[PDB]
Amino acid sequence: LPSTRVPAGARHPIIMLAEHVADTFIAMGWELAEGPEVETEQFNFDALN
Amino acid sequence: TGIDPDLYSGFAFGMGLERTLQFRNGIPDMRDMVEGDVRFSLPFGVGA
Amino acid sequence: LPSTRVPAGARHPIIMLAEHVADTFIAMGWELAEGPEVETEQFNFDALNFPADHPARGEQDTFYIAPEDSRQLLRTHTSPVQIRTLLARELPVYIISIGRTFRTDELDATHTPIFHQVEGLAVDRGLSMAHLRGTLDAFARAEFGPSARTRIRPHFFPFTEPSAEVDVWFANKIGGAAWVEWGGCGMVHPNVLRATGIDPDLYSGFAFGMGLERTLQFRNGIPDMRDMVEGDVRFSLPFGVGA
Amino acid sequence: QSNAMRLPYSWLREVVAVGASGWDVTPGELEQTLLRIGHEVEEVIPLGPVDGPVTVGRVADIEELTGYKKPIRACAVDIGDRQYREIICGATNFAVGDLVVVALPGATLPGGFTISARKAYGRNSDGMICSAAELNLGADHSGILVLPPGAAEPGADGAGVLGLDDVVFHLAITPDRGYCMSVRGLARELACAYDLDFVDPASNSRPPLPIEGPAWPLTVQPETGVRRFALRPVIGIDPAAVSPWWLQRRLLLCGIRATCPAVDVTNYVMLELGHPMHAHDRNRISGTLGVRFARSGETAVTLDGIERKLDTADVLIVDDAATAAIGGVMGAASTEVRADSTDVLLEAAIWDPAAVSRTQRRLHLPSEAARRYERTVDPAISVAALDRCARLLADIAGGEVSPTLTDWRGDPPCDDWSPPPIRMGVDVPDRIAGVAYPQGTTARRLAQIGAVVTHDGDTLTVTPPSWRPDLRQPADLVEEVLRLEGLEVIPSVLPPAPAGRGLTAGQQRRRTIGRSLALSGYVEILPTPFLPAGVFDLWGLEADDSRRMTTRVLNPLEADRPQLATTLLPALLEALVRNVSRGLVDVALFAIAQVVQPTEQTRGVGLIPVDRRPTDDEIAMLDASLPRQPQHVAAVLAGLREPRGPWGPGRPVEAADAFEAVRIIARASRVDVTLRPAQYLPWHPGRCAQVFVGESSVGHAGQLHPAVIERSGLPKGTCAVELNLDAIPCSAPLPAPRVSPYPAVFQDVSLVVAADIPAQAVADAVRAGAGDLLEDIALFDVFTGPQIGEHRKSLTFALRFRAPDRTLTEDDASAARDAAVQSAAERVGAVLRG
Amino acid sequence: RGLTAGQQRRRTIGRSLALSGYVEILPTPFLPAGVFDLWGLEADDSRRMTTRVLNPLEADRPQLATTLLPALLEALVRNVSRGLVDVALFAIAQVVQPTEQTRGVGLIPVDRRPTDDEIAMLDASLPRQPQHVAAVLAGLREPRGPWGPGRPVEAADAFEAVRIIAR
Ligand SMILES: Nc1ncnc2c1ncn2[C@@H]1O[C@H](COS(=O)(=O)NC(=O)[C@@H](N)Cc2ccccc2)[C@@H](O)[C@H]1O
Ligand SMILES: [Mg+2]
Ligand SMILES: [Mg+2]
């Protein structure tokens, strides 16, 4: 008989691939940096030459 | 950024995450991975 | 009103500390090696440069496995994983190994017959005691914080030369704060490299072995390890699910 | 405690001060110095303390008080200038004229016991006669402390004569530094640590006794491993003579109780120089002394009066009558000296370390000599320690040291005891330490520890001293330089590790399973591998059940639990019983641990030579010899699975909860699993599922057998699951789902089958007939009753149909439903309900 | 040094909600048209103070989201309309909340490192972008089966999702 009263969910495959990529680079000694989604032109364009 | 280019060099890259997923899983059309139907996510597992 | 129909469980704090230690070394480019809990004498003693009929071997608190001529035992330390790793992998090698170890010690505040150890092994060209100290300092910094007091002093292990022990200042130690041993370390003995087919003139190495429960006691200030080894759910639940 | 070394600081200072007069350090600084060079200080025991009038006294008069069940004495003691004090004492080991230490009223003994003038046994008592324990001087022995004659004058300060300002150091010497099992070695280490000139207390100039001829006939079997055997006699001593106080006190502070001067000098020289000494009665040896292996079943009664079953590998000392000593372990009562002995023949022998280690471990005799011979003894000091021991015995108990000497040094006779020379690069210690030591540091440090050091370009030739057999390779020399310079000067450099690959799939899966079960309410147990006693009998397992074939430990801490676990359930059920008995009755526990499963190929493997890499076949036979140790995952449940609260009364644990724990593990492992009816103890034969991945069995789950639960004292309805993780193949799926946006058609179907047809078989048949249009199928009703008929049951499934490229019509969905019903009819005999 | 505490917590929250039956949504920052009017929010509700995009792909959806619920509710409506009526969705994403200090900054010379004050005015000029966690539930929280008829979503389920995130 079926037994799953609490059906499983799922994190998004895009997020799960990001975790796998992150773990790959962390295992090589790298770290993860962050930044906001709404950005100034200064950092999105001008400071990038 | 205040870094001397005569003392330091560097490389940088920027790859698509969805593009990586399409290459890795052989997904030709990214529509399902961006529309948020639960039937797209559930076959991938909980991800815990 | 309360809402939790499915009360939270808990992975064991010892296992969760092992995960945190593992993640610390993986973030430095290291990997995790493994080995069985029941071991031969070959890898637990002999290949680790232990003499045959000598107190360095006899004084060990060893669980010997029947029959008397079996040369099998419950491994007394994770150091036989050094031998398995050097036989199975090409050089250079930067691994740790976290698994259970067994000794005939009665349960007290800091000893239990079934405990865990964090083994470390690095074999490469040009490694020295300075690299060993750099690695232990990162280990201590990540588990005990930047204010931790550690000290290193000479000791003896058959599989290291020179050998050392690292102490940690245990504030919550029963009877008053004191230095307490954290683990052993040293430069990999040339006989160990010879037993694994490695030229000691071209490669050197360091290795360490620290107590996992001992680390937890220092990190969380737990003076008596009884609760962490008796398996009462009231000990684990305050640590959280650990997901 | 075989590595222990107890010695008083006053003795250490004396040996060090010879080469460096005035050397004296606080006990706290001495402790740190010993730790910095590698000597573990287990305990620092100060003597006393003592305050007030604690004075040496002379027992002047003893009047026995009769009438009591215990002998009680009323004593008058001279405390100085013939000023007498009346003391009531219950001890008997003293007579008139003996030197005793009395604590007068006002004095304070360790710890805090103040003496007062009292009246006991109807007599006056102006103090007490102290014992060694009451003064915090020696161990708790029978009687009061009697100083040897002439130790002090009546009236002398007790703390000064007893040396209560001294400090005793208990050291745990590592087994590679056997030379440190003496005052000689430890004083040398302090001279190295403090850069002092050292005078060896075992040197010849510190003169040798004359050698006219042999002292006793001796034949030595060379295969016994003996490296040296020395004998020098001392004839005509006084049996009534005793050892002076300085010698008895130093033995006392080192843990050795004094007996007679013949034995005291053998123990004193052993502690001072590190070479064990044995005293024989010259007139009790009958014929030529022989060193040989024991015979098959040969016996020997040691000096303690215990018969020893000797082995072929045990090295003995025998003459023409009986065995005199078990070589390097313990002497026999044959030639043992006593109050009758006046001619003493002293023995200084170097035994093979491995032979002594074998014998002392098998006979359980870790004597003071065996502990040192086990860790090698300097063979270059045998005659020197023999002459020092012989002169000391004659100086104490009189007599003449015979100018004869036997000195067997092997065949051919060995005249050089230094280990082979070692060639090492000059900067090798600098490379290992990561420190640029000052010029000459390595050469100076190696000379301090006693090695001859020659220099030739960039290579040092180092010849270690005879008391340092541990110095065999350049790495050994590296340790000597670094530990004396201090390890704290070594810098801290993190190595740039190459890019690693992180966690393996199996390591990652162990984490995911742990997270999934913990989030579902399970508490992790770290299960003991030692099985409960009689557990498989409680389970009622058959005699040939493979779980009974266990690996056994020879020396378990619990004698009734020597068997290593072939399954994780006994430990989990034991952990469940502990929690329930403590008032926590609603428990779900889990464990991820290996088990131990020996086979007929499980066996011992003899020593593989370690001077090279083991061959591939040697690696294969080492691995094949160990019992199988697969990783299992297991869980047990009891009580309420869902607690009670404002939502309702909760839900008790049922077998379906164990089945869901299987599916929790399977989803965390990303594998598909089928559950099939099975009978397998200790599970309930009607509520037990066998778990398959494909066609491979991986474990079982369900409710435990009620008879197992009853016999084991478990909670009623307890459930359990155990899977073999190593039998679950690691899966790395890369899904590429295609989601149809077209509308779905919902239809339900109700099918009557035989009551014993599993519901999964009916669903599989429906799915097989429905085809690709079937998106989802869910059972939501299982009904029995007179409407259906006996031996039957009705199952109702919710079906969701969907087309990938069009809006599915109600008719096209019914055609797929009809085909699903037809398939169920053919495969499980399902009848559409009407 | 590996992952930070915040990065690790984002993973733990995702694992905990997914194991509890929630399906992750990557929420669009472009608000549905008229969503706050559908909610009946007051005119001065801070959620109405939105950052606006000049050139959206949908002309009627230029406002950036000050809350994750409009996108999640839109994702819920899509699933329900496709026949999947028992849904629990969640999202871990930032929102965009401008203040009166939100403003444009003229070009800073790029021939040198920006001064500390120039870094401060660049950061202070951007709208607040805090990370939110949100979830929506509809239909049956527990499905029906051989155990019983299931259980509809109730407010207590949302309260438990709070305690899932808190633990
Ligand atoms: N009975 C015990 N219970 C709990 N923890 C224990 C127990 N016995 C030892 N430990 C811990 O394990 C650590 C190492 O123990 S040890 O016996 O002294 N050393 C070893 O086992 C060596 N294999 C360590 C080592 C040394 C050199 C190179 C590599 C590895 C100790 O510092 C303790 O923290
Ligand atoms: Mg032993
Ligand atoms: Mg130690």
Ligand SMILES: [Mg+2]
């Ligand atoms: Mg050494």
